[PDB]
Each structure stands twice: as C-alpha cells, then as structure tokens.
Amino acid sequence: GYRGLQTQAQSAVTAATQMNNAWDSLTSELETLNANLRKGIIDDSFLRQLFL
Amino acid sequence: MNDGMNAQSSQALHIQTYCNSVRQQIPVDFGRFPNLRESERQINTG
Amino acid sequence: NQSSQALHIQTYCNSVRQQIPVDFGRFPNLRESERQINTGLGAARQHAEHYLKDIQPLIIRNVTNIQDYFETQNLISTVMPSGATKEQWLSA
Amino acid sequence: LGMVSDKAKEYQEVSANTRRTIGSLNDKLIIDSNNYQLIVVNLNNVVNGNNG
Numbered sequence: 001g002y003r004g005l006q007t008q009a010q011s012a013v014t015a016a017t018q019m020n021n022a023w024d025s026l027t028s029e030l031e032t033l034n035a036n037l038r039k040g041i042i043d044d045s046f047l048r049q050l051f052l
Numbered sequence: 053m054n055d056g057m058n059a060q061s062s063q064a065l066h067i068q069t070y071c072n073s074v075r076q077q078i079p080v081d082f083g084r085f086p087n088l089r090e091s092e093r094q095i096n097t098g
Numbered sequence: 099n100q101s102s103q104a105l106h107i108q109t110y111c112n113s114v115r116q117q118i119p120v121d122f123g124r125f126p127n128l129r130e131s132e133r134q135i136n137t138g139l140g141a142a143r144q145h146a147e148h149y150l151k152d153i154q155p156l157i158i159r160n161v162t163n164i165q166d167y168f169e170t171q172n173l174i175s176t177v178m179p180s181g182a183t184k185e186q187w188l189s190a
Numbered sequence: 191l192g193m194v195s196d197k198a199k200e201y202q203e204v205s206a207n208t209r210r211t212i213g214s215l216n217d218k219l220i221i222d223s224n225n226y227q228l229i230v231v232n233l234n235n236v237v238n239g240n241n242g
C-alpha cells in the first residue's frame with residue numbers, strides 16, 4: 001500500500017515539476033514583453049515599432 | 053543556436069529529474085548501533 | 099511510436115553522458131574490469147560530445163544549404179526560356 | 191502602452207507567486223514520498239528478519 005502511495009507521489013512530483021516549468025516560462029515570456037514594451041516607450045520613430 | 057538550446061533543454065530535464073530523485077533519498081538511523089552515532093549524524097548532514 | 103535516426107543517436111548520446119564511473123574497490127577480482135569499463139565509458143562520452151556539439155549540427159547546416167540551393171534551382175529550363183540570349187542561358 | 195506594461199508587471203508578479211505555491215507543493219509531495227519509502231524499507235527489513 002505504502003509502495004503504491006510512494007509511486008503516486010513520485011508521479012505527482014513530475015506533474016508538479018512540469019507545472020513549475022510552465023509558470024516559469026509564462027513569467028519569462030511576460031518579462032520579455034515588459035522589456036520589449038519599456039524600450040519602445042523610450043524610443044521615438046522606427047526603433048519603437050521594432051520593439052513593439 | 054537551435055543545437056545548443058535543445059541539448060541544454062534535455063540536459064536540464066535529466067538534472068531536474070536527478071534533483072527531485074535525490075530529494076526523495078530518505079535518511080537512515082543506526083539508532084540500534086551505539087558505535088555508529090557519529091556515522092548517522094555525518095550521513096544525515098551530508 | 100518509430101524515431102528519426104538523429105533523435106535515436108541524440109537519445110543514446112545524452113544517455114551515455116549520464117553513465118557514471120563505478121569503483122569495484124571492495125571486489126579484488128573486478129579491479130581490471132572497473133578500470134577497463136571506466137576508460138571505455140570515458141571514450142564513449144568523448145564520441146557523444148563530438149556527435150552532439152559538432153556532427154549533428156554540421157550535418158543539419160550542409161543539408162539546409164542544399165535545401166535552399168535546390169529550392170532556388172527547382173527545375174532545369176531544358177528549352178531556351180522566353181526573351182534570352184543563348185549565351186545568357188549557357189552562363190546561368 | 192504604459193497601462194498595458196503596468197498590468198503585465200502585476201501579472202508577472204502573480205505568475206512568480208503561483209510558481210512559489212507549486213514549489214511548496216513539490217516539497218510537500220517530495221517529503222511525503224520520502225517518508226513513504228522510509229516506512230517501506232523499515233517494513234521490508236522487519237519481514238526479511240522475521241523470515242530468518
């Protein structure tokens with residue numbers, strides 16, 4: 001029974017690690033958009049449209 | 053760039069797996085052995 | 099379910115990288131075995147790093163260039179095409 | 191754009207928060223699985239002695 005529970009937890013660990021990577025990716029993607037945005041506000045003409 | 057990013061991505065998952073696996077490594081207690089008091093603590097710390 | 103040739107090697111490569119060195123130090127009869135194994139494992143690792151870091155990438159590059167080339171030169175103009183000199187066709 | 195940037199920043203912070211939650215969940219599961227394994231080994235030892 002404990003052995004079966006241990007397997008269930010091991011799988012849940014993989015599932016959780018996956019969810020952690022997913023959120024980490026979303027967080028990074030947001031940071032990139034933020035950086036892309038910020039550099040476009042302190043840009044006037046063509047370099048603004050590039051970052052945008 | 054693609055070759056380096058991919059190789060790092062498989063490499064990372066391999067370490068990520070090894071990491072969580074080591075976390076599951078349970079501590080052992082030589083509590084029955086009086087002479088292995090230091091051994092148990094040393095092992096636990098490591 | 100079957101893998102591409104490259105992916106099969108790519109998997110085998112990373113797998114060999116994970117091959118840990120063993121010490122049969124407790125076993126006196128396995129002394130030569132352990133050293134031999136360790137050495138062979140080390141060499142295999144070298145083969146993989148090369149395959150991964152250089153070989154597969156270089157192969158991809160050459161193929162890509164070839165792909166781009168044939169893309170541009172998709173079909174041979176067997177006949178003198180419309181409004182060109184014979185010399186122009188010969189040069190091309 | 192500035193408004194959108196601010197909103198994204200808040201969303202980014204929220205994403206980091208969710209990740210932390212996941213991290214805690216991971217640790218909790220890891221600890222559970224480990225304790226389970228420890229019980230299994232303790233039990234295995236009992237039956238492996240008892241059978242001598």
